[PDB]
Write a protein that binds this DNA or RNA. Structure first.
Lengths: 36, 126, 156, 106, 197
RNA sequence: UUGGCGGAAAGGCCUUGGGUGCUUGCUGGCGAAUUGCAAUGUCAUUUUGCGUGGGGAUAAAUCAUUUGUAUACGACUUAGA
RNA sequence: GCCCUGAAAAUGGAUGGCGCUCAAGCGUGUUACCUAUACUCUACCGUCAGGGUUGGAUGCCCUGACGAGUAGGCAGGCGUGGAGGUCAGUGACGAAGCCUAGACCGUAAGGUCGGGUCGAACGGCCUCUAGUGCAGAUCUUGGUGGUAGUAGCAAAUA
RNA sequence: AAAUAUGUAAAAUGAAGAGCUUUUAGUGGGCCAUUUUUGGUAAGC
RNA sequence: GGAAUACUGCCAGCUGGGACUGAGGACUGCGACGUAAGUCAAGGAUGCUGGCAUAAUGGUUAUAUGCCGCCCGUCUUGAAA
């Protein structure tokens, strides 16, 4: 019954904003490759 | 018995004390504006001291009035006192701090004769 | 001089007030206040007493009586906003309360005029009260709120 | 009788507030037996007293009163807003207040 | 409306009861919770035990006597759930927590007082049938509480005495009901029934 | 006052007998006013003192000295009418 | 569609916490409710603007709208040393200064009064003039704290 | 041929200040994002 | 075949409770009701009544409680450290 560590669901601001930037870049590349 | 006046409202009775005057003895309470570009007091962040401004200015009808409804006029002698002879509903006399006791008694008698209110009739009274 | 005289002084002419458009029209009581109604006093030295409402005075007060012999509340005036008007009523046809007014209650021991007027009014009030059962006991009793009583839902 | 009460019991809950700023000029009052704003409408304008005790006797009494009135309803559960002549102290959160039946419209 | 409210904690969901108690205490009501060993938690016993073991592993590394104190008793588990819902580091929160008592079983003097329930926290009224749930006594004993048997024996003794009291009360109630049934035909009975009593 | 019962934190529950009051179960007779048209309009219970009359019981600990199963100092542990 | 797997280490910890399971989760619909220096209405302060004013005009009256701010710009004020004029100003029956759990005026710079202490000078107004206003400069000079009755006064045999 | 998206010239809506000539101060970096576009990477770009 | 009701909208329809405000200060205006006299809710609050007259209201101060509030200045870079 050695319960192991559990991953935190508390989201960090750095990760949240990085994910926002990743999504924006993903959409822009989707548009460009759909054009190509 | 002064002229009738509206009830006197003070918008800010608390003294405007300088920032950190409580913290440092070398900083007096006399109001000074903070001039640093990063001053949170200057930038008006929440929870800091209030600062003097014209909006706090008092109503022009009840400005300078005592609760009795008179403006204070400093008198040094009977000639100064007699200037208020006609304006006894608007002005009350305050005897100057440096008048002697024997001149204060004369001034008080003259003011009582003229029906002039005196703001400090108890100074230097035996 | 300690202070230089001002070159201008405010005038001492006490100007008169303007003509005011505020007439004093007679008070309109709520519907539940009709003479003969039993009403519960909500404040004063007689708070909780159940008295009888006689007539509406000129200073907008209400003339009430216990009657004094039933519960010890004399001929008095009360404010209408400090009572609860109950649904029980008694006829006041045989009661003559046209001699009671603000000058009657002017204050400026206990006066014999008030004693005798109390007796006279109590006579007819008692005669009318003795018609319906338990009403005298009701007037003798005092009112209070019990545990669980909800005044917004109680019918008075 | 054993009851002489001519008032309704209430509790002083808190000041009017947002999540992070309170307004001490308004008190929220929970009146016993009142569970909806419609019922709370009965008590609007009624006088309310906070009655407390002090060691020092003042003008022939050790009992002191803070007076106020019920102004409007608050929320969906019968809480009311009240205003007192002097704002109620904050230590009285959870203390008892008296809501009188006057000025009466019944 | 009572000066003290005694809640029988049996068959209540821990968090909903804790929320109710916290609001009542903050609003100024004295509360005594009895039978904390009979409180319920929704979810499987293994799941709630896992959550407690996570709590158990949390501790201050350089000095364990400083870290979170893991209380094992059911009354203390409930108290923890309540203190989490009070602002306990303020004077107002401390005064609120001073208005609460929590017990295992029903000791004196509360064993002869009326016990109430909190319907918005009752398992039978809240949980959907078929949902697994956990009992606080079993959870506490599995994590290290050592008085489950003593409390059970004392509660059995209390139930025996309470059953005797209820038998006597039932007899007296029957006698009084008969005495009132013989008076249903009187004039006062008719008048009271006309008035609704 | 009789007789029980309760140890979970019992400190409370029940019962016996006599005395003493009240009783709104029913009918009567006197009082209330002037707090002046509201003002908590003062009725609860914690503690601490002082005065009376009703009783009760007549110690220790510490320092200082002393031991070393103890000991940086404290502390600890022994002994001494 | 929801659910499980779809890899992740190393002090004890995080949907913010408690906790929540016909939710206090997810999708959706309908209402009610809470509260910003925002919006509406009112009072008051100031700025600006537009009307009127031959009977303090640097004013007075009426009306309307506005009010964030670094550099910078413009204006109105507060305080200090000394100079010309004036108040035939204050004063040993107490000037100045200092202290004050006391009082009042001003949005403020500041001003005024009472009480105490004290002992010889000092102010209001109109003007002139400048060595004229401090929290900082590892600022200058002087004074004084905490550290602290702490470190230490254990070579030289006694 | 409805207009995504800019110019010229003349109806809508709004506006009490506009044009010219002399003058004076401070200023002389950029970071983040949307949109379009050209060139790219395993992917970022 | 005949209605009713719902829903949405309109009323220069009626009526009850609550809260905040009372700026201005002779008259002048626009109206309303009246044969008129005049009255009115029509260019901003008046009437009646009570208690107290002092620490009662209020000020100041010390604290307590609820919420809020990071230590100032300089200097750098968008910016922060």
């Amino acid at each position: 019954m050695r319960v192991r560590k559990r991953q935190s669901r508390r989201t960090s601001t750095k990760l949240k904003e990085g994910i926002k930037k990743k999504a924006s870049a993903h959409r822009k590349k989707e548009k460009k490759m759909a054009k190509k | 018995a002064s002229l009738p006046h509206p009830k006197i409202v003070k918008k800010h009775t608390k003294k405007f004390k300088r920032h950190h005057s409580d913290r440092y003895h070398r900083v007096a309470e006399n109001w000074r504006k903070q001039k640093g570009i990063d001053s949170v007091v200057r930038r008006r962040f929440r929870g800091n001291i209030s600062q003097p401004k014209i909006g706090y200015g008092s109503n022009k009808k009840t400005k300078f009035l005592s609760p009795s409804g008179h403006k204070t006029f400093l008198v040094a002698n009977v000639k100064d006192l007699e200037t208020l002879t006609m304006h006894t509903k608007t002005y009350a006399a305050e005897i100057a701090h440096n008048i002697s006791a024997k001149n204060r008694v004369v001034i008080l008698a003259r003011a009582k004769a003229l029906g002039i209110k005196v703001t400090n009739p108890k100074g230097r009274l035996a | 001089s300690a202070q230089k005289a001002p070159k201008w002084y405010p005038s001492e002419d006490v100007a008169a007030l303007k003509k005011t458009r505020k007439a004093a029209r007679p008070q309109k009581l709520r519907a539940s206040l009709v003479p003969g109604t039993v009403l519960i006093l909500l404040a004063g030295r007689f708070r909780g007493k159940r008295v009888v409402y006689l007539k509406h005075l000129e200073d907008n007060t209400l003339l009430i009586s216990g009657p004094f012999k039933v519960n010890g509340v004399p001929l008095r005036r009360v404010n209408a906003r400090y009572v609860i008007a109950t649904s029980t009523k008694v006829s006041v046809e045989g009661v003559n309360v046209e001699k009671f007014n603000v000058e009657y209650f002017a204050k400026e021991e206990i006066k014999a005029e008030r004693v005798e007027d109390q007796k006279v009014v109590d006579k007819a009030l008692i005669a009318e009260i003795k018609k319906t059962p338990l009403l005298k006991q009701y007037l003798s009793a005092s009112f209070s709120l019990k545990n669980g009583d909800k005044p917004h839902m109680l019918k008075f | 009788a054993e009851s002489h009460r001519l008032y309704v019991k209430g509790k002083h809950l808190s000041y009017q507030r947002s999540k992070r700023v309170n307004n001490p000029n308004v008190s929220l009052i929970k009146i016993e037996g009142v569970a909806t704003p419609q019922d709370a409408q009965f008590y609007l304008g009624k006088r309310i007293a906070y009655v407390y005790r002090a060691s020092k006797e003042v003008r022939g009494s050790k009992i002191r009163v803070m007076w106020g009135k019920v102004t409007r309803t608050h929320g969906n559960s019968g809480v009311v807003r009240a205003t007192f002549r002097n704002n109620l102290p904050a230590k009285t959160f959870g203390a008892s207040v008296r809501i009188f039946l006057y000025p009466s419209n019944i | 409306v009572e000066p003290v409210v005694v809640i029988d904690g049996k068959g209540h969901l821990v968090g909903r009861l804790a929320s109710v108690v916290a609001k009542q205490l903050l609003n100024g009501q004295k509360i005594v919770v009895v039978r904390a060993e009979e409180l319920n938690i929704s979810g499987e016993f293994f799941r709630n035990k896992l959550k407690y073991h996570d709590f158990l592993r949390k501790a201050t590394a350089f000095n364990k006597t400083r870290g979170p104190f893991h209380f094992r008793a059911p009354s203390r588990i409930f108290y923890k759930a309540l203190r989490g819902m009070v602002s306990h580091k303020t004077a107002r929160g401390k005064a609120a927590l001073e208005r609460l008592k929590v017990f295992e079983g029903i000791p004196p003097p509360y064993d002869k007082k009326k016990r109430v329930v909190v319907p918005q926290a009752l398992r039978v009224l809240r949980l959907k049938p078929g949902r697994k749930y956990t009992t606080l006594g079993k959870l506490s004993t599995s994590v290290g509480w050592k008085y489950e048997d003593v409390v059970a024996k004392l509660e059995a003794k209390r139930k025996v005495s309470s059953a005797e009291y209820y038998a006597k009360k039932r007899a007296f109630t029957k006698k009084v009901a008969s005495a009132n049934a013989t008076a249903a035909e009187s004039d006062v009975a008719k008048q009271l029934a006309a008035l609704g009593y």
